[PDB]
Design a protein around this nucleic acid. Structure first.
Ligand SMILES: [Mg+2]
Ligand SMILES: [Mg+2]
Ligand SMILES: [Mg+2]
Ligand SMILES: [Mg+2]
Ligand SMILES: [Mg+2]
Length: 61
RNA sequence: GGUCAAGUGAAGAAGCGCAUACGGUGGAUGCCUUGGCAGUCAGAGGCGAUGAAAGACGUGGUAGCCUGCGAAAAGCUUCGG
């Protein structure tokens, strides 16, 4: 999720973008706990998405 | 071919010694180096309340330790190769 596409939004709909990833990061950890996870790379990929949204969310001022 | 007497006296090693040939233990010697020591020529001579030097705990798809990072956590954004 490139930061270039992230600057096209506003703080109002970037904050829901961050909430959407927290669902996704949570759901992936519930699958990992039960052992029924097949897309293992998605754990480290979702972590990077939240960090990038929080990066752009700090630049608006 | 006998009987007797006198004399003489090889081998026979429980274990051991020396020599030699093969092993075992052990780690020397030789050769080697990703580690040190001592100079010369430069650098820049401080870091810290914008939180230092030194750490604890966490951070990975899976157990530990080291090396990096800090709930944005072996990384996030922009430039340049
Ligand atoms: Mg020998
Ligand atoms: Mg000098
Ligand atoms: Mg460590
Ligand atoms: Mg934060
Ligand atoms: Mg580039």
């Amino acid at each position: 999720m490139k930061a270039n596409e992230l600057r096209e939004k506003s703080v109002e709909q970037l904050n829901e973008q961050l909430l959407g990833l927290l669902r996704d990061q949570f759901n992936l950890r519930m699958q990992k706990a039960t052992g029924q996870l097949g897309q293992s790379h998605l754990l480290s990929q979702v972590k990077r998405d939240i960090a990038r949204v929080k990066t752009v969310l700090n630049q608006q001022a």
